[PDB]
């Protein structure tokens, strides 16, 4: 089995991932391609192994949050295109060219200076660029028909840059009111008709995320960007109810009990503040996970774990590296038993959506804030490895 | 100055850590030594450089959460003693003996089997052991006067082990009501005077954390365990008001503005959900930090940052890698300005404790969940290095 000094770990099921990608393949047009999104350390699942696997089973490009996230992928052996979705400083232009990482950009001045920087070094490859159009998200990108015409011309003269795409982003595609998503769509096809009547040919167009591809597959165009659905999680409860694609969750979290005792002597106080007093014959177990791992402190006298197919509550305040649970009056448990924090055990289950609702947040934040000091194990074909 | 692809970062001031250690030395008896607590990546500040500095200025031993956190310290050169505060499985006995790590123990059968493992291998290293006594925390350790004497008996009968300390933990020593802290103390003295009426000689004795070394210095016995005080933060508002010792905070979090635009054309929505709508001459500025870095999604439409010595508010929902802020109806700023997120700027300040209050938690959690994908820079004698 699994041999650790501190006994807490994560398991990622790679057979779930490949299944999730087929379901999405068979929904969108045959003519469209898939860009796997693995930023923030693969949404907390580990970026290297999920990307490797995704590119074997349907995907052909990848997307990350920064140059540094992309360089980790090339050092692991990957030669596919890698797109950087945020903003990159002119200070990393030559190093992105060297590692062949694709960059987003949307200003005339940025393109002129990035061109001169590689001009003054010759001995270079050319730098590939996607243009970001802002149709309603308000974060990054260009916003008028004239501005965008200026940027396509500054890019077409620049001998060391090369134009490989143009995209946008919907801000409310997971919501049952489709008003603003459709208005974004026709703003975008507008700007592209203009560029065309000018005599300008187009590269790869992409605009959909998980929710958009499931709910508006006729917006697929050349490419889509698959993120949260790769990992078996739905963007919103609304999109799940539509019942159009069946996904399977890939992540679960576990530990082993560290100690078991009956509260006979006194005092019978438990954890900081002494917010919990046991009864003379209650049984209290101690487990090795805390808020510095990503288990929220606000779950103090409130959360659950699974022990032997049943839910036992958390007793007292959460601490930095450890929590206590109550097995009840004359409990039943041993040092060494296995406990489930997120996932399945026999019949019972505690899902990540259940925990996120209990904390007033979204499943996105619950997985991608899991500390890197927890070791990750991968299952593929029934067998474990790392 | 500093040059980054994605422009966000942490500054830790080691001149402040040094002043924090001196204030504590003068306040406690010269009899007693200081063990520095650097578990969980040095409460988020980075374990390696904080531990070096601390051993140079008054600490003589270290504490961590697990055998793996200690092995990172030994790989960087540190030869001081290191105690594991949590439970270590028997599968790591041989490994702890080889890297000279000290472990907590409190069970007769664990003692017995640990000693067998090293005997059945010859082993020239004796494994150092500290005994945990539970007087009111109800987390780990032995609970009755009788049963402590069995463990002491078994430890002495094991030639491959070595007894180098005995300790306990105060569960409410940061609270105006001192009832329970006097009772635990009384019980702990009882058990050790019971022990030394039987002939036994005792080793290093420690019970104090930051709070209890400040309010009850007559408890320092042989050694104290300094954790949150090291980083320049108070364990509670009450302890801070008693105005007995003066602490300076070490950690700041900064970024650089990525883009700037005024919301002239439509639509003027900002971020997911369209929860904020700009005015037609409002300036909106985009920052490269988000909830996967550890900036809570709960700060959506209600947190602040510092730009040019002012407070500016978050606009719309926090996203995974970026936030948006509003500069006002004709605000001023350029792509490139420096922004302070936790800390001090011009004359202004946003303290970690204000942010914790906003979220109904404690400063421990705010700092120890800052992500490892953010670079940490160190300033010592008013200058920087990494
Ligand atoms: C521009 C962009 N595309 C695609 C994605 C993936 O989004 P989702 O996880 O909702 O599929 C994200 C996040 C994003 O910011
Ligand atoms: C047993 C023990 N001792 C000492 C400390 C350090 O505590 P503090 O940061 O409150 O000083 C901790 C944490 C702990 O768990
Ligand atoms: Cl965007
Ligand atoms: Cl303890």
Whether residue B274 and residue A372 make contact (CB cut-off 8 A), yes or no, is no
Q: Which of A40, A294, A320 sits opposite B364 (nearest CB)?
A: A320
Residues of B with Cβ-Cβ distance to A370 under 8 angstroms:
none
Nearest residue in chain A measured CA to CA from B299: A361
Ligand 2 atom showing the smallest separation from residue B235 Cα: 10
Q: Are B31-231 and B251-385 the same fold in CATH? A: no
Which residue lies with its CA nearest to atom 13 of ligand 1? Answer: A227
CB atoms inside a 10 Å sphere around CB A382: 6
Ligand 2 pocket test target in B63, B184, B212 with most atoms within 8 Å of CB = B63
Please tell me the distance in Å from A68's CA to the nearest CA on chain B.
Answer: 8
- Residue A239 and residue A215 in contact, taking contact as beta carbons nearer than 8 Å: yes
Nearest residue in chain A measured CA to CA from B43: A292
CA of B65 from ligand 2 middle (Å) equals 11
Whether residue B258 and residue A86 make contact (CB cut-off 8 A), yes or no, is yes
Distance from C-alpha of A225 to C-alpha of A62, rounded to nearest angstrom: 8
Q: Which phi-psi region, left, alpha or beta, contains residue B308 (left: φ > 0; alpha: ψ -120 to 50)?
A: left
Q: Which of A39, A85, A372 sits opposite B372 (nearest CB)?
A: A372
Name the residue among B168, B170, B163 with its Cα closest to residue B202.
B163
Residues of A with Cβ-Cβ distance to B284 under 8 angstroms:
138
Domain boundaries, chain B: 31-231, 251-385
CB half-sphere exposure, B74, CA atoms < 13 A? 17
- Residue B10 and residue B34 in contact, taking contact as beta carbons nearer than 8 Å: no
Distance from C-alpha of B377 to C-alpha of A310, rounded to nearest angstrom: 46
Name the residue among B190, B182, B202, B191 with its Cα closest to residue B130.
B202
Task: Print burial letters for B43-75: b (CB count within 10 Å at least 16), e (below 16).
Answer: bbbbbbbbbebbbebbbebbbbbbbbbbbbbee
Whether residue B271 and residue A372 make contact (CB cut-off 8 A), yes or no, is no
CB atoms inside a 10 Å sphere around CB A213: 23
3-class DSSP state of B380: coil
Q: Which of B95, B140, B324 sits opposite A259 (nearest CB)?
A: B140
Please tell me the distance in Å from A31's CA to the nearest CA on chain B.
Answer: 29
Q: For domain A251-385, give the CATH superfamily.
A: Lyase, Ornithine Decarboxylase; Chain A, domain 1 (2.40.37.10)
Q: Which of B98, B106, B139 to mutate to test the interface with A (most CBs of A within 10 A)?
A: B139
Joined tokens for residue B152: 């002491």
3-class DSSP state of B163: strand
CB atoms inside a 10 Å sphere around CB A302: 12
Match 């300076």 to its residue by tokens: B248
Distance from C-alpha of A60 to C-alpha of A343, rounded to nearest angstrom: 30
Match 């393949």 to its residue by tokens: A25
Joined tokens for residue A119: 């001009």
Distance from C-alpha of A258 to C-alpha of B295, rounded to nearest angstrom: 32
- Residue A141 and residue A133 in contact, taking contact as beta carbons nearer than 8 Å: yes
Q: Does domain B31-231 correspond to CATH entry 1.10.3720.10?
A: no
The ligand that comes nearest to the alpha carbon of residue A87 is 3
3-class DSSP state of B80: coil
Please state whether the peptide bond connecting residue A223 to the residue before it is cis, i.e. omega within 30 degrees of 0.
no
Q: State the pairing for strand pair A61-64/A82-84.
A: parallel
Match 């167009």 to its residue by tokens: A205
Angle subtended by helix axes A145-157 and A108-119, to nearest 10 = 10
Distance from C-alpha of B76 to C-alpha of A342, rounded to nearest angstrom: 35
CA of B7 from ligand 3 middle (Å) equals 17
Ligand 1 pocket test target in A43, A140, A227, A229 with most atoms within 8 Å of CB = A227
Task: Print burial letters for A7-31: b (CB count within 10 Å at least 16), e (below 16).
Answer: bbbbbbbbebbebbbeebeeebeee
- Residue B284 and residue B270 in contact, taking contact as beta carbons nearer than 8 Å: yes
Which residues are within 8 A (CB) of A34 and not within 5 positions of it... i.e. 6 or more apart?
Answer: A21, A24, A25, A58, A59, A60, A61, A223, A224, A226
Sign of the C-alpha dihedral computed for residues B158, B161, B164 and B167 taken in this order: negative
Whether residue A183 and residue B267 make contact (CB cut-off 8 A), yes or no, is yes
Whether residue B265 and residue A143 make contact (CB cut-off 8 A), yes or no, is yes
Q: Is the CB of B88 under 6 A from ligand 2?
A: no
Residues of A with Cβ-Cβ distance to B44 under 8 angstroms:
292
Whether residue B171 and residue A319 make contact (CB cut-off 8 A), yes or no, is no
As beta bridge partners, residue A83 has A63, A102
Name the residue among B284, B258, B279 with its Cα closest to residue B268.
B279
A320 is in an annotated binding site: yes
- Residue A375 and residue A9 in contact, taking contact as beta carbons nearer than 8 Å: yes
DSSP B267: P
CA of A300 from ligand 3 middle (Å) equals 36
Burial, A367: exposed, middle or buried (Cβ in 10 Å; 0-12, 13-18, 19+)?
buried
What H or E segment, with its residue span, contains residue B53? helix B47-56
Q: Which of A86, A263, A371 sits opposite B288 (nearest CB)?
A: A86
Angle subtended by helix axes A145-157 and A179-197, to nearest 10 = 50
Which residue lies with its CA nearest to atom 2 of ligand 2? Answer: B169
The experimental resolution of this structure, in angstroms, equals 2.3
DSSP state string for B190-204: HHHHHHTTTT-----
Q: Is the CB of A85 under 6 A from ligand 1?
A: yes
């Amino acid at each position: 089995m699994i041999k650790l000094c501190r006994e807490v770990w994560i398991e990622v099921n790679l057979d779930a991932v490949k299944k999730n990608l087929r379901a999405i393949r068979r929904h969108i047009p045959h003519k469209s391609k898939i860009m796997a999104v693995v930023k923030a350390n693969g949404y907390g699942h580990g970026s290297i192994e999920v990307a490797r696997h995704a590119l074997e089973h349907g995907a052909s490009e990848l997307a990350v949050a920064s140059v540094e996230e992309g360089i980790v992928l090339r050092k692991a052996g990957i030669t596919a295109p890698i797109l950087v979705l945020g903003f990159t400083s002119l200070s990393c232009v030559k190093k992105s060219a060297a590692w062949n990482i694709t960059l987003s950009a949307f200003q005339v001045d940025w393109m002129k200076e990035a061109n001169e920087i590689l001009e003054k070094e010759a001995s270079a490859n050319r730098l590939a660029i996607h243009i970001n159009v802002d149709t309603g998200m308000g974060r990054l990108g260009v916003r008028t028909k004239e501005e965008l015409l200026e940027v396509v011309k500054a890019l077409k003269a620049s001998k060391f840059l090369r134009w490989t795409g143009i995209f946008t982003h919907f801000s409310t595609a997971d919501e049952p009111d489709t008003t603003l998503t459709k208005l974004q769509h026709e703003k975008f096809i507008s700007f592209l008709s203009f560029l065309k009547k000018q005599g300008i040919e187009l590269p790869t167009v992409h605009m959909c995320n998980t929710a958009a591809a499931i709910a508006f597959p006729e917006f697929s165009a050349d490419m889509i960007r698959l993120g949260i659905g790769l990992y078996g999680l739905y963007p919103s409860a609304y999109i799940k109810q539509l019942n159009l694609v069946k996904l399977e969750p890939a992540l679960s979290l576990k530990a082993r009990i560290a100690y078991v005792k009956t509260m006979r002597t006194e005092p019978r106080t438990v954890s900081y503040g002494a917010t919990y007093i046991a009864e003379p014959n209650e049984v209290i177990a101690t487990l090795p996970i805390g808020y510095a791992d990503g288990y929220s402190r606000a779950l103090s006298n409130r959360g659950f774990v699974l022990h032997r197919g049943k839910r036992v509550p958390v007793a007292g305040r959460v601490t930095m590296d450890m929590i206590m649970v109550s097995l009840g009056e004359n409990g039943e448990g041993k040092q060494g038993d296995e406990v489930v924090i997120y996932g399945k055990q026999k019949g019972a289950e505690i899902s990540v959506d259940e925990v996120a609702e209990m904390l007033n947040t979204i499943n996105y934040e619950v997985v991608s804030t899991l500390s890197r000091r927890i070791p990750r194990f991968y299952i593929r074909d029934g067998e474990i490895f790392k």
